[PDB]
Amino acid sequence: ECCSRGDAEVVISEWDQVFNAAMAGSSESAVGVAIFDAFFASSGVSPSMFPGGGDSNNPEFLAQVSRVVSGADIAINSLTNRATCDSLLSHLNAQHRAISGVTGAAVTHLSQAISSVVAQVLPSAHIDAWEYCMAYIAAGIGAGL
Amino acid sequence: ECCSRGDAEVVISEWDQVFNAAMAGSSESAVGVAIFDAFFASSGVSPSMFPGGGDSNNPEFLAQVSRVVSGADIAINSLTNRATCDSLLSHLNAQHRAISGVTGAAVTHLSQAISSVVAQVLPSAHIDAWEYCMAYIAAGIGAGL
Amino acid sequence: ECCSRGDAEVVISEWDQVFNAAMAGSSESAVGVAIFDAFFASSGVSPSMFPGGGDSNNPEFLAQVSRVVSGADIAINSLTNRATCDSLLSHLNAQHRAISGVTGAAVTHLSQAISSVVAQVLPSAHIDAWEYCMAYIAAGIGAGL
Amino acid sequence: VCNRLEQILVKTQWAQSYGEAENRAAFSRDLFSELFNIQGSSRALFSGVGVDDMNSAAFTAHCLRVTGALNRLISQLDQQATINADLAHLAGQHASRNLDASNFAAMGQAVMSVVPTHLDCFNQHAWGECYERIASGISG
Amino acid sequence: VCNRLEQILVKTQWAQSYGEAENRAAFSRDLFSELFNIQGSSRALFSGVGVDDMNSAAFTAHCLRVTGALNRLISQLDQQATINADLAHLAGQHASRNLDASNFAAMGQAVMSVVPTHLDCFNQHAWGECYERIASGISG
Amino acid sequence: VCNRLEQILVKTQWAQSYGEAENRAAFSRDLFSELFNIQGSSRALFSGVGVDDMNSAAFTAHCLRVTGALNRLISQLDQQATINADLAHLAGQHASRNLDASNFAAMGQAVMSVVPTHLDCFNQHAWGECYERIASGISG
Amino acid sequence: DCTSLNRLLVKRQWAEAYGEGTNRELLGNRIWEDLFANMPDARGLFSRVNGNDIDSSEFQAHSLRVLGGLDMCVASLDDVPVLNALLARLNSQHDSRGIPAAGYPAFVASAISAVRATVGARSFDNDAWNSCMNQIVSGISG
Amino acid sequence: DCTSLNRLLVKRQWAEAYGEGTNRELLGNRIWEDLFANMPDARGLFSRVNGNDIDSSEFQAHSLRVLGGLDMCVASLDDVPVLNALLARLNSQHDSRGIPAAGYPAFVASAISAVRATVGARSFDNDAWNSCMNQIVSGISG
Amino acid sequence: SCCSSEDRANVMHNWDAAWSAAYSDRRVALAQAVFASLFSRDAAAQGLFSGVSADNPDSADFRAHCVRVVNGLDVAINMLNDPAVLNEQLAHLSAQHQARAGVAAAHFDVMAEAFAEVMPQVSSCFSSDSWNRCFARIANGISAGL
Amino acid sequence: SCCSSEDRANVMHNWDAAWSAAYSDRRVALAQAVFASLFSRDAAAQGLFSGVSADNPDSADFRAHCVRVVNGLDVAINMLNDPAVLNEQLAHLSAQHQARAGVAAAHFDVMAEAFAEVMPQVSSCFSSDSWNRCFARIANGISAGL
Numbered sequence A, B, C: 001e002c003c004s005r006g007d008a009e010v011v012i013s014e015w016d017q018v019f020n021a022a023m024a025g026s027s028e029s030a031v032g033v034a035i036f037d038a039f040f041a042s043s044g045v046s047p048s049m050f051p052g053g054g055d056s057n058n059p060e061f062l063a064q065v066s067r068v069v070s071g072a073d074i075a076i077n078s079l080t081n082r083a084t085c086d087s088l089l090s091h092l093n094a095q096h097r098a099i100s101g102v103t104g105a106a107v108t109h110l111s112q113a114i115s116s117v118v119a120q121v122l123p124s125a126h127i128d129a130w131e132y133c134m135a136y137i138a139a140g141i142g143a144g145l
Numbered sequence D, E, F: 001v002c003n004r005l006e007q008i009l010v011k012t013q014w015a016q017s018y019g020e021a022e023n024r025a026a027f028s029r030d031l032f033s034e035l036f037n038i039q040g041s042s043r044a045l046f047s048g049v050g051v052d053d054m055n056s057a058a059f060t061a062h063c064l065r066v067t068g069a070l071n072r073l074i075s076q077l078d079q080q081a082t083i084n085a086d087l088a089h090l091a092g093q094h095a096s097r098n099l100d101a102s103n104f105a106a107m108g109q110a111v112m113s114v115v116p117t118h119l120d121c122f123n124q125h126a127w128g129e130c131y132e133r134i135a136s137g138i139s140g
Numbered sequence G, H: 001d002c003t004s005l006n007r008l009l010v011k012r013q014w015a016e017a018y019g020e021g022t023n024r025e026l027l028g029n030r031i032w033e034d035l036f037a038n039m040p041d042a043r044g045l046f047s048r049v050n051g052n053d054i055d056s057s058e059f060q061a062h063s064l065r066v067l068g069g070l071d072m073c074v075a076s077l078d079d080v081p082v083l084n085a086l087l088a089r090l091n092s093q094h095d096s097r098g099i100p101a102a103g104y105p106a107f108v109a110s111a112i113s114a115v116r117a118t119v120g121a122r123s124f125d126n127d128a129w130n131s132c133m134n135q136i137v138s139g140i141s142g
Numbered sequence I, J: 001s002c003c004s005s006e007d008r009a010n011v012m013h014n015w016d017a018a019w020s021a022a023y024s025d026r027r028v029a030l031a032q033a034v035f036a037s038l039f040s041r042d043a044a045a046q047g048l049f050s051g052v053s054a055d056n057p058d059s060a061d062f063r064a065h066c067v068r069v070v071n072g073l074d075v076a077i078n079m080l081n082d083p084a085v086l087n088e089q090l091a092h093l094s095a096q097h098q099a100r101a102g103v104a105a106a107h108f109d110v111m112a113e114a115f116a117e118v119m120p121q122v123s124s125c126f127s128s129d130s131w132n133r134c135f136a137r138i139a140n141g142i143s144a145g146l
């Protein structure tokens, strides 16, 4: 139920839709910063906490953004296979456990930011399934945080 | 690996083969007692422990045999779906935990008895896959016994 | 007519048959020398005319044999496409024109040797089509010789 | 009740539906689905086996034991002494749970609303006669 | 090394193989499969991520992060400042593990033995040039 | 260079691509297509065989002799004395044409950019090792 | 000898073997063409149902009839009492014919042979078939 | 006799013949059902691997093993030295059994027969097969 | 009255089900039921089977006789597509009943309606018409000259 | 540890390629390489094969032994789908090694990693896991009771 085979399939579809054969491999950054900006707004978190403390034009923060969108992509594209997704998420979990300043309440903020931006870019976005799944991913990463 | 999708498929096949459209629904008993006799021999267990204490011609023991072959069938036919198989097995586990005289070392004896008899009746029997799976089923039932 | 689409197809088939997925890439030599021996016999030509003058166990003559069977294979596998086959043959022609000791009457001898050996190895050999085509190939190589 | 001949029809038709069926887990789950839809008062009667979610491994495990039991009985319909014993075993496995006569009567409606759909032929009576034979055995 | 144009071929061809591919988990696992088969000495170098069983959820999780990283880099090939930073991040994530130059050189052989099979066209050089660009970045 | 085992992989994979292939004329022409696209300086190096038009019977004739030679060598990889001789023959057939070491190095890139696409499996190294073995033989 | 489990395997395989409609003829001839081969001197016992022209209606009926009886025995293998009675009748139906002792052994070899070709030698249990095929003949020939 | 070209044809056909997995059993039985027919007196030599129940695991292993050896010889036909050594071992593995002289001839007939049915008599070169099958037996029986 | 092609196929189906080539236990249930009525509607008929423990249906001696009949009918039902052969069989089966002092044509009508009563209870969606059309085709052959 | 169905199929494929049923020249290259390491990582082991010109790998006497092994493994690998039979074979192969003073269980582990090193060099896209899973299944049977 909670983010089932179909939900995931659509998510992975619409996600690979925002990153189709024309967009992906060009501006994951434009999408990425958009994510963060939306993140900072909701989470309230201090941008002065990531590489280069935000600054959309900071070589470090960019690389940082890239690595975030990537992680998200790795997890999303694996929602169909539960077993391995849990692993992927736990790994992420561990990485954040080791970062003083990551609250479970925020992980979901960042997770909801992805969904929201996806919808902005992809109007078709099944905002119901996305949250259903991004909820799952937000649980694995911020598990216990 | 240990009793994988394919193994199970073949098992469930060959089992539904011993119980095809001609045999099943007639002499699960003939097969059933055969199982027990082979059980008693290996396990050494006392037949004077089941309903009617063996006695192949005991109305009680028969019903008993039937219920055993049935359980085995329920579990076998569910090897493809792990999640629900574990449940089925745990239930069996519980039932045996509540029976002073069931050793894990014996559960496998009974489990290996099924495989063996299957092979006798169905010469084709993939005795490698059967043991691979009957091992799994023998673990769930005699878990902790 | 003279070695038509079908003939060629069968030739190329039966040839790729003598050199299937088991034989080819192992003993083109065994076949090759067999060719020559059969050649020398019919043509009467002096084996003491090729690299290492025959001597089935001569590193030079072997390489030589290989290069002959190869040429034959290149031409055969191109009988379906006339245009390019003519080219391939003319090239061969030129190469032999520059070798004092190659008579058109012999070229066909070598060509008929291939067919014959093919039949020995591949009993199925359509000895009618083979000669029909090997005739064509023998004309291009020994053209004017 | 379930005579020598009415046992035939049934046994063959159960094989034809339950046997031929794709994945029993669905067939099994489908069965209880009806039982609930024709008698909601019972859905909670399985508060143990995780009925809250019928697609659960927990619940499906239960449905199988039943369609499994339902199966280990039909094949024993000809064996009076044997099936009587088995039925006794079962009837008593239902002692604890407060079951009225409407539940079993509902069960039969569930079983007989599922089975026919999977067949080309299905004998109304013959089935009821035997479900009775079984139902009784599992209660009194 | 990986110039403006050699970056094109590569980016498109990675999309054509890794992108078009069926289930990355297989493509990813397949990659490490080679790395081991062309340099067994490394198979144990991943004793952490449950290499004992490559079909494990544990191990597959790892392969994905790599084909994932491998992906988050190729798309950044045009962004000098950005990819340099990322590469720095990665190179340092490999500091702990004792990696020689044969490992990376093996990795490239692994990556370039997998990719071509999934394409109709594949530029040998252009790829090596860029794998280099990446390999270096992730070590020195 | 091209050891007993690396010869296996290669021989089988050449059969799997060149052998299984549809019409060698295309496979052959395709090969030289790359050689030119990865080293245009060579396209004119075949001014004799009518390179002006690669679809010509004239040019295709040439590509075949090469993929043909390339074939008559791989099968002889196990025969040291034999292939050495053949290679000698070839190397000397290339004496006249002014060939540098970048040409052969380009040839290998051409051969190894074509082959993998036609396979499910392709060993990077093993191939290079053997192309080397051949390349050397045909020059020095 | 013919253990219960054998009877199981024998009942099953014979089911598969015993075709449907005229497919039984397929099996039928199979066992006959064999019997009449290894033992040509046996075709004479069927001069009435025309053992000479195996493909004729006479013998085809006959052939089919035989498989019929042989199917009862198999189907009855579980219930010894009825089987005895079945074998008794059969026995009295061969009591007249001057059937050679070495006839039944041959027939059994041909049958067990036919069934095998029919169900495929997928690990054909010769011991089970023979052990049981013999239990049958015993009551008929004796 | 077994000319190089024969070895070629023999290697090739045997390749095609020598099936894969349990298909070899197909061929296996083929040569056995024959041998044990024309020469029933030969089934006794295999009382250990259960020559009586050809379809049993014992004999099936055995059967398969035989095809194994027979595949080495064929595969080794080009290299005489290794072949000799291969035949030597085989020979010492039959040195004990009281195998009748007229056994190998029979076996060879059954094999050459099996392969033929298997690869189809598409102009089957009996001379090549016999000429070579004999070169083999020679080292084993003698 | 003509047991057509669509009829035999249809009957062979009815008889395909409700039948077990593996176990005789069912063949007997069917037979017994057939005899049940047969006698029940012709006490006098039961006498013809004194040669079998008819007095005790549930007796080996008898159930054995059931198998023979049930088998004989099944053997004929399967020839239903190969007329030429069937004739030989019915001819045969016929002579066997002639060899039985008593059993006369009429009797096959009681036996006819006997099966006609039991079948619908053993085979699902049984098609009476086709069975009546073909059961005759067969019975007529056995009762012929009887 | 269980050599599954998908495993044997996968292994039979690996071994399908890198194999020639026509010429033994390759079977030998494979074998030799296997032995190469085997001894290279257990000089003492090489002694067990004094009965074969091990001292001279490139010798008929030896290459002949290679064929036997390479063949024996191929014979077992093909039974991998028919367990019952395989057992008989491994059982057999087993007794043959017992008949060899020396060779003990351990040795099969060196032989294990020996193949594990050579295969990836002979068969393309070789799947180690499946080979390790099944190579055991086989080896265990031969080294059993040894």
Ligand code: HEM
Residues within 6 Å of the ligand: A045, A049, A050, A051, A064, A067, A068, A069, A070, A071, A072, A092, A095, A096, A099, A101, A102, A103, A106, A107, A108, A110, A111, A138, A141, E089, E093
């Ligand atoms: C939706 C859930 C999230 C995703 C997809 C995600 C994923 C990632 C990934 C893949 C990395 C790079 C791994 C590495 O460091 O090697 C990372 C690092 C990091 N994340 Fe997250 N993250 C999430 C939520 C958050 C939140 C809510 C915070 C806290 C405000 C946060 C702060 C950081 C920081 C500070 C780093 C380390 C930057 C560095 O490399 O120095 N993350 N995250």
Ligand code: HEM
Residues within 6 Å of the ligand: B045, B049, B050, B051, B064, B067, B068, B069, B070, B071, B072, B092, B095, B096, B099, B101, B102, B103, B106, B107, B108, B110, B111, B138, B141, D089, D093
């Ligand atoms: C392969 C594993 C086994 C299977 C398939 C199995 C399954 C079952 C099933 C389905 C029942 C009936 C459930 C019920 O009581 O309501 C049962 C009951 C029972 N089992 Fe097992 N069992 C296994 C092994 C064993 C062993 C090894 C023993 C001990 C020697 C044993 C002894 C019993 C006894 C005594 C009962 C209760 C009989 C009664 O109803 O009074 N079981 N088992």
Ligand code: HEM
Residues within 6 Å of the ligand: C045, C049, C050, C051, C064, C067, C068, C069, C070, C071, C072, C092, C095, C096, C099, C101, C102, C103, C106, C107, C108, C110, C111, C138, C141, F089, F093
């Ligand atoms: C059926 C027609 C023939 C085929 C397939 C054929 C093909 C070839 C090929 C492909 C080569 C190697 C090209 C090279 O030298 O670079 C060659 C060379 C040669 N051929 Fe032929 N040939 C044929 C007939 C003959 C005949 C009848 C003779 C004369 C008796 C002959 C004697 C030679 C000699 C002496 C060489 C040069 C050997 C060397 O490399 O020094 N060929 N031929």
Ligand code: HEM
Residues within 6 Å of the ligand: D042, D045, D046, D047, D048, D049, D065, D066, D069, D070, D093, D094, D097, D099, D103, D104, D105, D107, D134, D135, D138
């Ligand atoms: C005649 C049809 C029925 C059959 C064959 C049947 C079968 C079964 C079986 C085999 C079990 C599991 C026992 C075990 O292995 O521990 C079970 C349990 C149970 N049955 Fe039935 N049953 C029938 C009728 C009913 C009816 C009519 C109801 C009520 C609507 C009912 C209520 C229950 C309940 C509540 C349990 C206990 C499961 C739990 O909550 O733990 N059953 N039944």
Ligand code: HEM
Residues within 6 Å of the ligand: E042, E045, E046, E047, E048, E049, E065, E066, E069, E070, E093, E094, E097, E099, E103, E104, E105, E107, E134, E135, E138
């Ligand atoms: C240029 C290609 C490579 C890329 C893009 C890459 C990618 C990665 C990534 C993304 C991780 C996981 C880091 C994390 O999120 O915590 C990782 C870990 C690791 N990598 Fe690499 N890598 C490369 C080269 C190599 C090579 C050549 C080797 C050795 C053969 C290697 C050895 C390792 C090991 C041992 C780990 C640690 C995993 C563990 O055991 O916990 N990597 N790599």
Ligand code: HEM
Residues within 6 Å of the ligand: F042, F045, F046, F047, F048, F049, F065, F066, F069, F070, F093, F094, F097, F099, F103, F104, F105, F107, F134, F135, F138
């Ligand atoms: C290792 C791979 C190579 C093989 C197997 C090969 C094969 C051949 C063969 C068989 C011929 C025809 C000879 C004849 O039959 O007369 C040929 C000719 C020729 N090859 Fe190569 N060759 C190789 C490398 C190269 C390279 C690297 C180049 C340059 C880019 C080159 C340049 C030429 C030229 C220019 C000719 C003469 C054709 C003409 O213009 O008339 N080859 N080669």
Ligand code: HEM
Residues within 6 Å of the ligand: G042, G045, G046, G048, G049, G062, G065, G066, G067, G068, G069, G070, G090, G093, G094, G097, G099, G100, G103, G104, G105, G107, G136, G137, G140
């Ligand atoms: C166990 C195997 C056998 C079975 C099931 C069997 C059964 C039968 C059956 C069903 C009949 C027809 C009885 C009737 O309606 O009167 C029959 C007749 C006959 N059987 Fe057998 N039989 C078997 C083996 C043999 C053997 C071993 C022989 C001799 C080679 C043999 C020779 C005959 C002959 C001569 C007849 C009479 C032909 C006629 O109808 O005129 N039977 N058998």
Ligand code: HEM
Residues within 6 Å of the ligand: H042, H045, H046, H048, H049, H062, H065, H066, H067, H068, H069, H070, H090, H093, H094, H097, H099, H100, H103, H104, H105, H107, H136, H137, H140
């Ligand atoms: C050229 C054809 C033949 C080949 C390739 C061959 C090869 C073999 C092989 C591979 C073995 C197993 C050796 C071992 O592992 O100990 C064997 C055993 C045996 N062979 Fe042959 N054989 C051939 C012909 C024959 C003939 C002509 C006979 C006699 C009719 C025969 C009778 C036996 C016997 C009796 C055994 C021993 C059975 C046992 O394992 O107990 N073989 N043969």
Ligand code: HEM
Residues within 6 Å of the ligand: G089, I045, I048, I049, I051, I052, I065, I068, I069, I070, I071, I072, I073, I093, I096, I097, I100, I103, I104, I107, I108, I109, I111, I138, I139, I142
């Ligand atoms: C059309 C349906 C019938 C078929 C196919 C059939 C079948 C058979 C067969 C196969 C036998 C055993 C042959 C033997 O060993 O002699 C038999 C015996 C016999 N039948 Fe029929 N029969 C049919 C109808 C009838 C009817 C209508 C009657 C009279 C009421 C009858 C009277 C008998 C008697 C008296 C015996 C001998 C009893 C004994 O001594 O065992 N049959 N029949």
Ligand code: HEM
Residues within 6 Å of the ligand: H089, J045, J048, J049, J051, J052, J065, J068, J069, J070, J071, J072, J073, J093, J096, J097, J100, J103, J104, J107, J108, J109, J111, J138, J139, J142
């Ligand atoms: C699992 C892999 C192996 C297989 C399938 C295999 C195969 C064979 C075969 C088929 C033979 C020839 C049978 C005969 O004629 O006696 C043989 C002989 C032999 N094997 Fe193995 N073997 C294996 C592993 C080993 C190991 C691990 C050792 C010890 C290091 C070993 C020691 C020997 C020895 C000493 C001989 C006899 C040498 C001679 O005198 O010719 N084998 N093996």
